[PDB]
Nucleic acid binder design. Structure first.
Ligand SMILES: [Mg+2]
Ligand SMILES: [Zn+2]
Ligand SMILES: [Zn+2]
Ligand SMILES: [Zn+2]
Ligand SMILES: [Zn+2]
Lengths: 49, 1425, 57, 97, 107, 86, 84, 49
RNA sequence: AUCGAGAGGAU
DNA sequence: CTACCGATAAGCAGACGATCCTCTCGAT
DNA sequence: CTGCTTATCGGTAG
């Protein structure tokens, strides 16, 4: 869980290859669902980032 | 099961006769003589002593020895022993009846206190219930205190017939401790009643004088209420806790029998020894304690009965009392084998019905498949693989009677299987498993699945089965149970299975749908602006596992062949599907892509989203289930998913703080609109400070300042939202989710980007918890928004401390009624659950409980399964007479009203046919009878109602099935139709009786459905509106019957439980104590949960007992007329109009001391008492709200004390009204006796209990002259307090439409059948306030159980739990051992048809699957070779 | 007369709502409450035209 | 794991009766007792090998039945006897209705 | 049928059941002003001849008591003036099927 | 990553994201008697009283305990302790 | 009390509860090595064999439907209309 | 303007757990409550010893 | 393992 | 014009309180 | 957030 009660569990692990990379070449360690905003309304989370 | 075959026959339990233990049958049963209070140790020797346990009961050491019985341990139960008592004992819980029976009997001769010579006693003795009989008997025998020698006869009141013997006086029995004290009457003879004598009197009560009281000659004698010989439970009932050898730790009950036997011994140590006469009974009350404490312990008597270390000790009772207890926690809900539980994760690549089981848990659980040449080839290689690799097993049980443990056993690799052995294999792919999430209060909360074994330690399920179980994946855990019999596992995939459970029965709509990513993608994919090309399309096409193997021709070819989204998503939607919507601006050529049209599993126009694909009623999921099946529909989910995911997986969708930042102008334009919204507040804060505010009908200037303020900031926040809302582009992710339904309502947009808003506590803005202020940060009396907690900032901007805090307050308010709430919610859930239960639909389509009582005569008033129902419009009750005739009227004799021949092929030679018109008038005569009738059912005019068989679709399918064209004429006759439709209203059976009473009640269940039928299947409709053909019209008829037959409820359905949950489920959603009227006091009404808690308890005293009075038909819209009836109902006391009550010393009653009165006496003299005058000033204001005049007031007082209080009064034209009265040896003290009567005991005009009467203008919709349903508003009074018995009888009102939220009253006055109705309406609105909808059936059922009996049986302990159900059913709820006691005390008999009894006996309860037998037909097996 | 008549239910309506009964744009609601935040939070509307009530989450 | 009341009450709803007997027997208590046909009680002494029963008190040896009830039920029936309350067990209904 | 105005002596009211086969009913004036059966909520109760009753049981396979009951002093029940054992064919309107019949034996 | 669940990169999990140690502690005593009859730690082996557990006792040294180096797994024995009671 | 094969009221349609038990006690016997009255076209699962035994309507079992006064109606799967 | 006392800094109305939340004044009221019931279920280095 | 309580997970 | 049955009003008592799941500590 | 037991009154009976 981040620091806004936005919890949840790993539902699968992908490797660097199958992960979505940026032009930079980076890749994320975590990919959370866009539906975890509107409902709860944790805007600090977006800002923290 | 239980090891070792026994010769004795296998039979189930049918009856259970409750009774009591007779000492004579106690001594015949026992085998051990029990006399010694030790345990083992024959002087330390490792065995047991022949005194306590082991005297011939059950052993411990692992010794066969149990009086040769061998077996031992796990095969021999417990053998009972007895313990001779030196002196009789009171049974702890039989105290009340032992007192009651003594009060009901005379000593010395032992006989009923009242013979049949007493007539009032006959009525009591006539009652055919041993419960209530002994109840009315005790109310009559509590008065008598003399043994009557001679009694008045049946003839004359001077002659007497003799019956009983010597007539000693009888005592008044009170309880104290464990004995009974009495007082013979000349100063009381105070002595205690001995257990030794009570039995001597209880033995001597006649054989017929038992049965008259609730007792039995055989099973339960009032003499066996007193313990003479105490039976002793074996070890299995109070088993030790052994630690090897030379270490023993025994159960508590065991210590009890020691302490009892040690007391009983010290007793017989005084009898046969030098006893101190009355120092014996000192220790006799000890034996009365220990034997009374060994059964019960939370008694009235304060001694708790500790064992050293301060241990309350579990008396047998506590072992059974609900929760954790033997009955509830150990019999109704056992812990189980073959079960598992872990963290659930979502998996968008499994089908709906599937559930990914971790490989480990599949290695652990097992299924015992019986070896047959059908499976030998497989099951053997399984056994070979052992219990380590997945496809394998962990036991092999030969038919002999002994297992083979594969994880050991030298012969795991060898092993020959044989035809008939049970292999215990691992759970495998495609086995049936009951899957479940707690808290379980749905059918949905428990559903069967298909095990698909996977790696990784999570249970996996399908996103779209999330809302039934109510799951997220933030850490939830779920239970899994694995069936064990081929017959049992079948009972799962044929009922419990997931697809079978899609059409939720409690709300007549599909409970599963499409959610989140798949639902937010399907919108993005659909928009015509979304296009897909060759390479990607092919993947998507391969992705659907039902793809016809033919790539569809591209919606676009031109320069480059592109496909549309809609074009390929339609690969997921099967063939033959039809869906019509039309949202707002939907026109066959929607300019906004609104609504939806699906013909032949193809999208034609309209973006797909929630309304279409969600759990909506008129959606795609609903259709495909009724149109194609549960098997074919579950697959539909997977298709939509597998594809949409794949696209989204490549398209991408996100959210950032950028999705909550509005324009430069738009933001300023918001802050400006909150600016004028603040000055709008300030001004109407100065208005209120310069005392210029109007009062409002809504009470209190201060209350009307708050109303005004809240409604300015709430109004401001909301239109500040609609600004940012609209400023948001179409390429805004947050707005994109709002549209697709996936998550996020508009306020979430409003608060985030625009303005948080006003926070509230209890209903009003924050209070002055700081003495005239909210935070120490403000000055006193700062009544403006920011002081009173209006957060102006948007979450993005960020709150300020005051805002932050005042926002924290308004947040906590919920968390609290999620804590105080849940407790009482689950107890109303469990109550209903247990109250209904046994109620099931029987094969005669009745609806009966376990007793065999009818509750509904046809389940839910029509005999239809709730799952098969939709909100279809009744077109016959709507519209105007003008529209009606322009629509349902075919006149073949009229040139301008005939079916234009351009319709029917046979129409041009029909104009005029007199014969055809006689069967074309009868269509109308009935269509009109339908209207007149319906408008009298639904008086609202409401047309949309729950009915089986959606016809719009069943017809629209015929529209696109046979491709009918609206250009070329039809081939039906008018005789085809009218005689067709009619011949359908004889095929839609529900009941099926041979005779009158059934077939005349059968007509009734169909009556409504048929109106719907004549509504759509009329001539001017069928031909002109839809163009059906002889073929398609016959097909529609052929369908409608079938789908109506499939709509009928199945005998077996356990509606009781089903109906219960359906109310306790949304009752769980209900917000506790919200109060949307707190703030506007003096007009508060109970809402939500506590309001329900009231109804379910048949509550006498209620918080808001309003009773609505309607006006007389004519004088209903007249304002003043309304305030004339008002002033005739409101309880107006002299106290209401009085200002000041003064007392003067006016000595000369010919001229008043007060010069403001001089003018009064002149009159009341122009035209001997006492000098103490009593002045009363009445207010002119109040005296004209309730139309009264001085004369009327004065004439009323003068006739209360009548002609002994000298009363006078002024007129109606003096600056001050006055009532002066004088009185006629301390007369200043009698002038106050009467000061209080002139107030709280004198009525002027009004009904008592009716304080406050408010007038309100209601909207009523009514049949207009022209026919339309029109808004005609009446005046109606409301009230506080109830007096239905009288308000009704008042003139000027409509005494036919009077109503009270006190349904319990509308029983006592209007008769139980009206009470029922009132009770239902009172339930409905409680569940309808939440915004929750429950199908009439579920509620009506609960409503019926509360009435049928005769009165209003509460759904609590006092209510349904006292009824005539079997003992063991009523004892599974609240009062347990308290009922069991009385059960055997009155020789009760349990029928054992109840769910609970057979569940307690671990047998197959007659419930659905078990509502019958299935025997082998000898004469249909002989034919099959 | 002003005393006789009762409280008038005045609540700001929103045009950002679709109704089933009259399908009109006249719906008021009241934030709350069941389980606030994670999971989510209920949102109970109303139709002062028609009387219906629904709920979000 | 516990098959609580609520879980039982979901199975009743579904109508799957046999499954509930399975969740109550073969996967839980599943005991087996002998009752005397006459004074329906938990008294019959069972010498399983010599195929002799008998019922001292209600003198039997002949009329003896075999029941498949949950162990906890046995416990309750006994506990009640230990409170002087006689829970009878009869294998045939005389009442009708 | 006797109509009292305020209340009769508790002695006189027990000179009522003491003459078979002619039953006697008392009634209050205030309890008879408005006709309850006219009320919006109350369906019209119908008395069944002990023929139609003995015919009813048979077709629903009932044991008398199994039938839904009406209080002996139920307003409607005393309106029709009912006796112990008689049955009412309460025929009510329904929102799930036009009309729905129901039965109540008297307590 | 739907409905309160998230995808986590395995490569970073490998490289050592959110790794955590886990330290559980098992404890025991030798209990005396008012007549000097204490218990005893040791590696047990059958002998008259017999009662034991099913795990592999052979991971114990002799004093009664395992050595910090070793590697326990299933239902192995971690502390050997016996009670001499007549 | 025995209602004869005539004077028959109860639904001629086979209710879910009945079917779900018929298939059951049939998949039961099948697993217990009993004879099969239908050609098992390469089938191995009893429940999946009884389902083929059902559409061909070759199950020899009589359902005994009870009404709440004792009496009953005897129905064979042969007679019952399996719609669903 | 009759001020007697000033507040050292508004941010101190927070408790320990609550104080770790970033931009709490940008979060929906009850959200912070939740986060203040998990941070004490986390895995850190609770002490060096 | 029986017993009493406290801390924590899911709505 | 006192004797005693009956109605009613008023005073004090009881038995309920979500489902399930994991941890840790203490004691005859 | 109430059912069952007790006392105190107002009427009718030898
Ligand atoms: Mg959760
Ligand atoms: Zn034995
Ligand atoms: Zn006597
Ligand atoms: Zn509406
Ligand atoms: Zn016996």
């Amino acid at each position: 869980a981040s620091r806004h009660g936005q919890k949840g569990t790993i539902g699968i692990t992908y490797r660097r290859e199958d992960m979505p990379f940026t032009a930079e070449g980076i890749v994320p360690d975590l990919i959370i669902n866009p539906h975890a905003i509107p409902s709860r309304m944790t805007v600090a989370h977006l800002i923290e980032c | 099961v239980g090891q070792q075959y026994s010769s004795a026959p296998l039979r189930t339990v049918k009856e259970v006769q409750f009774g009591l233990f007779s000492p004579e049958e106690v001594r015949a049963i026992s085998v051990a003589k029990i006399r010694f209070p030790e345990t083992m140790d024959e002087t330390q020797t490792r065995a047991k002593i022949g005194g306590l346990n082991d005297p011939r009961l059950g052993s411990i050491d692992r010794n066969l020895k149990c009086q040769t019985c061998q077996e031992g341990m796990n095969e021999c139960p417990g053998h009972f022993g007895h313990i001779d008592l030196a002196k009789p004992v009171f049974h702890v819980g039989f105290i009340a009846k032992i007192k009651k029976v003594c009060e009901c009997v005379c000593m010395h001769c032992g006989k009923l206190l009242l013979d049949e010579h007493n007539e009032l006693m006959r009525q009591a003795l006539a009652i055919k219930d041993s419960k209530k009989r002994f109840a009315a008997i005790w109310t009559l025998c509590k008065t008598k205190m003399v043994c009557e020698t001679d009694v008045p006869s049946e003839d004359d009141p001077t002659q007497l017939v003799s019956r009983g013997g010597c007539g000693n006086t009888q005592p008044t029995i009170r309880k104290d401790g464990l004995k009974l004290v009495g007082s013979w009457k000349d100063e009381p003879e105070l002595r205690v009643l001995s257990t030794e004598e009570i039995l001597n009197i209880f033995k001597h009560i006649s054989v017929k004088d038992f049965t008259s009281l609730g007792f039995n000659e055989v099973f339960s004698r009032p003499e066996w209420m007193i313990l003479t010989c105490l039976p002793v439970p074996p070890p299995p009932v109070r088993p030790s806790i052994s630690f090897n050898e030379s270490q023993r730790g025994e159960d508590d009950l065991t210590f009890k029998l020691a302490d009892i036997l040690k007391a009983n011994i010290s007793l017989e140590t005084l009898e046969h020894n030098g006893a101190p006469h009355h120092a014996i009974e000192e220790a006799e009350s000890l034996l009365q304690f220990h034997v009374a404490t060994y059964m019960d312990n939370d008694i009235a008597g304060q001694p708790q009965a500790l064992q050293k270390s301060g241990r309350p000790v579990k008396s047998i009772r506590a072992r059974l009392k609900g929760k954790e207890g033997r009955i509830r926690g150990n019999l109704m809900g056992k812990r189980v084998d073959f079960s598992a539980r872990t963290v659930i994760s979502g998996d968008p690549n499994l089908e709906l019905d599937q559930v990914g089981v971790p490989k480990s848990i599949a290695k652990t659980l097992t299924y015992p498949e019986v070896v047959t040449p059908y499976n030998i080839d497989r099951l053997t290689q399984l056994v070979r693989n052992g219990p380590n690799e997945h496809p394998g097993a962990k036991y092999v049980i030969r038919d002999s009677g002994d297992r083979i443990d594969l994880r050991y056993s030298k012969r795991a690799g060898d092993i020959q299987l044989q035809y008939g052995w049970k292999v215990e294999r691992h759970i495998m792919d495609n086995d049936p498993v009951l899957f479940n999430r707690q808290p379980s209060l749905h059918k949905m909360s428990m559903m069967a699945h298909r095990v698909k074994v996977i790696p990784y330690s999570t249970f996996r399920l399908n996103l779209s089965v999330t809302s039934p179980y109510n799951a997220d994946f933030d850490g939830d855990e779920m239970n899994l149970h694995v069936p064990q019999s081929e017959e049992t596992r079948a009972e799962l995939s044929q009922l419990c299975a997931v697809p079978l459970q899609i059409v939720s029965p409690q709300s007549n709509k599909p409970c599963m749908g499409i959610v989140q990513d798949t639902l937010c993608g399907i919108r993005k994919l659909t928009l015509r602006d979304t296009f897909i090309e060759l390479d990607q399309v092919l993947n998507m096409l391969y992705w659907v596992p039902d793809w016809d193997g033919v790539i569809p021709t591209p919606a676009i070819i031109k320069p480059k062949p592109l496909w549309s989204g809609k074009q390929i998503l339609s690969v997921a939607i099967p063939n033959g599907i039809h869906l019509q919507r039309f949202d707002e601006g939907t026109t066959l050529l929607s300019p906004k892509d609104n609504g939806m049209l699906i013909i032949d599993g193809q999208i034609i126009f309209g973006v797909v989203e929630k309304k279409t694909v969600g759990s909506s009623n008129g959606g795609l999921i609903h259709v495909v289930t009724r149109e194609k099946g549960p098997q074919v529909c579950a697959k539909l989910f997977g298709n939509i998913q597998k594809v949409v995911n794949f696209w989204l997986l490549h398209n991408g969708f996100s959210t950032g703080i950028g999705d909550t930042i509005a324009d430069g102008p738009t933001m300023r334009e918001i802050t400006e609109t909150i600016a004028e919204a603040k000055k709008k507040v300030l001004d109407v804060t100065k208005e209120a400070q310069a005392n210029l505010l109007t009062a409002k009908h809504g009470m209190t200037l201060r209350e009307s300042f708050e109303d005004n303020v809240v409604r300015f900031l709430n109004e401001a926040r909301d239109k500040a939202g609609r600004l940012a809302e609209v400023n948001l582009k179409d390429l805004n992710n947050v707005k994109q989710m709002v549209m697709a339904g996936s998550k996020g309502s508009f306020i979430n947009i409003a608060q985030m980007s625009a303005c948080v808003g006003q926070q509230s506590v209890e209903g009003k803005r924050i209070a002055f918890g700081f003495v005239d202020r909210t935070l120490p940060h403000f000055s006193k009396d700062d009544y403006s928004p920011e002081s009173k907690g209006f957060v102006e900032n948007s979450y993005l901007r960020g709150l300020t401390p005051q805002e932050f805090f005042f926002h924290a307050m308004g947040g906590r308010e919920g968390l609290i009624d999620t804590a105080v709430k849940t407790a009482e919610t689950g107890y109303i859930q469990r109550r209903l659950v247990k109250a209904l239960e046994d109620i099931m639909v029987h094969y005669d389509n009745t609806t009966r409980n376990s007793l065999g009582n009818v509750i509904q005569f046809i389940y839910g008033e029509d005999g239809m399964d709730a799952a098969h129902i939709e909100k279809q419009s009744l077109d016959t009750i709507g519209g105007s007479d003008a529209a009606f005739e322009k629509r349902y009227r075919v006149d073949l004799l009229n040139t301008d009203h005939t079916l234009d021949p351009s319709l029917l092929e046979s129409g041009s030679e029909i104009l005029g046919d007199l014969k055809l018109q006689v069967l074309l008038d009868e269509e109308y005569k009935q269509l009109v009878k339908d209207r007149k009738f319906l408008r009298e059912v639904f008086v609202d005019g409401e047309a949309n109602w729950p009915l089986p068989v959606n016809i719009r679709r069943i017809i629209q399918n015929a529209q696109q099935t046979f491709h009918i064209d609206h250009t070329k004429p039809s081939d039906l006759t008018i005789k085809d139709i009218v005689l067709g439709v009619k011949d359908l209203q004889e095929n839609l059976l529900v009941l099926r009786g041979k005779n009158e009473i059934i077939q005349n009640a059968q007509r009734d269940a169909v009556t409504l459905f048929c109106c719907l039928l004549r509504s759509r299947l009329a001539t001017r409709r069928v031909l002109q509106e839809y163009r059906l053909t002889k073929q398609a019209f016959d097909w529609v008829l052929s369908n409608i019957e079938a789908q109506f037959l499939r709509s009928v409820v199945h005998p077996g359905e356990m509606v009781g439980v089903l109906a219960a949950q359906s109310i306790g489920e949304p009752a769980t959603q209900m917000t506790l104590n919200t109060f949307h009227f707190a703030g506007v006091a003096s007009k508060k009404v109970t809402s939500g949960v506590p309001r329900l808690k009231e109804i379910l308890n048949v509550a006498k005293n209620m918080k808001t007992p309003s009773l609505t009075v309607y006006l007389e038909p004519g004088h209903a819209a007249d304002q003043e007329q309304a305030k004339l009836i008002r002033s005739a109902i409101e309880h107006t006391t002299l106290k209401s109009v009085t200002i000041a009550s003064e007392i003067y010393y006016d000595p000369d009653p010919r001229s008043t001391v007060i010069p403001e009165d001089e003018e009064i006496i002149q009159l009341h003299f122009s035209l001997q008492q006492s000098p103490w005058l009593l002045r009363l000033e009445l207010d002119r204001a109040a005296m004209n709200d309730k139309d009264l005049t001085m004369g009327q007031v004065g004439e009323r007082i003068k006739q209360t004390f009548k002609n002994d209080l000298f009363v006078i009064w002024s007129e109606d034209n003096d600056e001050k009204l006055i009532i002066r009265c004088r009185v006629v040896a301390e007369e200043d003290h009698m002038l106050k006796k009467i000061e209080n009567t002139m107030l709280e005991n004198i009525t002027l005009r009004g009904v008592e209990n009716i304080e406050r009467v408010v007038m309100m203008k209601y909207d009523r919709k009514v049949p207009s002259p022209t026919g339309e349903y029109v808004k005609e508003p009446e005046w109606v009074l409301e009230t506080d307090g109830v007096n239905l018995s009288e308000v009704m009888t008042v003139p000027g009102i409509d005494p036919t439409r009077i109503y009270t939220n006190s349904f319990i009253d509308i029983m006592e006055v209007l008769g139980i059948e009206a009470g029922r109705a009132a009770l239902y309406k009172e339930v409905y609105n409680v569940i309808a306030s939440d915004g929750s909808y429950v199908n009439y059936r579920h509620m009506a059922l609960l409503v019926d159980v509360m009435t049928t009996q005769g009165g209003l049986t509460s759904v609590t302990r006092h209510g349904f739990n006292r009824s005539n159900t079997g003992a063991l059913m009523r004892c599974s709820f609240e009062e347990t051992v308290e009922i069991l006691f009385e059960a055997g005390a009155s020789a009760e008999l349990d029928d054992c048809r109840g769910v609970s009894e057979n569940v307690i006996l671990g047998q197959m309860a007659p419930i659905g699957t078990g509502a019958f037998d299935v025997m082998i037909d000898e004469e249909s097996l002989v034919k099959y070779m | 007369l002003y005393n006789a008549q009762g409280a008038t239910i005045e609540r700001s309506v929103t045009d950002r709502f679709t109704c089933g009964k009259c399908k009109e744009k006249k719906v008021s609601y009241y934030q709350l409450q069941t389980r606030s935040a994670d999971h989510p939070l209920t949102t109970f509307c109303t139709c002062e035209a028609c009387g219906n009530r629904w709920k979000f989450s | 794991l516990r098959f609580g009341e609520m879980e039982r009450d979901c199975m009743i709803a579904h109508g799957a009766a046999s499954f509930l007997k399975e969740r109550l027997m073969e996967a839980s208590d599943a005991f087996r007792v002998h009752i005397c046909g006459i004074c329906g009680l938990m008294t019959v002494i069972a010498k399983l090998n010599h195929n002799q029963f008998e019922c001292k008190g209600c003198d039997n040896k002949i009329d003896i039945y075999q029941i498949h009830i949950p162990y906890a039920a046995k416990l309750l029936f006994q506990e009640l006897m230990a409170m002087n309350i006689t829970p009878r067990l009869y294998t045939d209904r005389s009442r009708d209705f | 049928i006797f109509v009292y105005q305020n209340n009769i002596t508790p002695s006189a009211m027990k000179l009522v059941p003491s003459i078979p086969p002619a039953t006697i009913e008392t009634f209050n004036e205030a309890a008879l002003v408005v006709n309850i059966t006219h009320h919006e909520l109350v369906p019209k109760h119908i008395r069944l001849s002990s023929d139609e009753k003995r015919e009813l049981l048979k077709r629903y396979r009932l044991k008398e008591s199994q039938l839904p009951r009406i209080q002996r002093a139920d307003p409607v029940a005393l309106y029709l003036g009912l006796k112990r054992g008689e049955v009412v064919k309460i025929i009510r309107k329904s929102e799930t099927s036009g009309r729905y019949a129901s039965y109540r034996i008297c307590m | 990553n739907q409905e309160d669940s998230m995808i986590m990169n395995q490569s970073s999990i490998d490289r050592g994201l959110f790794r955590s140690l886990f330290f559980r502690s098992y404890m025991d005593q030798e209990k005396k008697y008012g007549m000097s009859i204490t218990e005893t730690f040791e590696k047990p082996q059958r002998t008259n009283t017999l009662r034991m557990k099913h795990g592999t006792y052979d991971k114990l040294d002799d004093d009664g305990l395992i050595a910090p180096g070793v590697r326990v797994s299933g239902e192995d024995v971690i502390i050997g302790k016996t009670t001499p009671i007549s | 009390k025995a209602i004869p094969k005539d004077q028959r009221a109860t639904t001629p349609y086979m209710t879910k509860y009945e079917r779900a038990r018929i298939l059951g006690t049939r998949a039961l016997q099948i697993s217990m090595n009993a004879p099969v009255f239908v050609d098992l076209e390469g089938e191995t699962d009893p429940l999946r064999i009884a389902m083929k035994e059902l559409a061909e309507k070759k199950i020899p079992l009589v359902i005994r439907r009870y009404l709440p006064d004792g009496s009953f109606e005897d129905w064979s799967v042969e007679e019952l209309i399996v719609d669903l | 303007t009759t001020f007697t006392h000033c507040e050292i800094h508004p941010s101190m109305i927070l408790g320990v757990a609550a104080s770790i939340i970033p931009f709490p004044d940008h979060n929906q009221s009850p959200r912070n409550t939740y986060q203040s019931a998990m941070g004490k279920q986390a895995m850190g280095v609770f002490l060096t010893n």
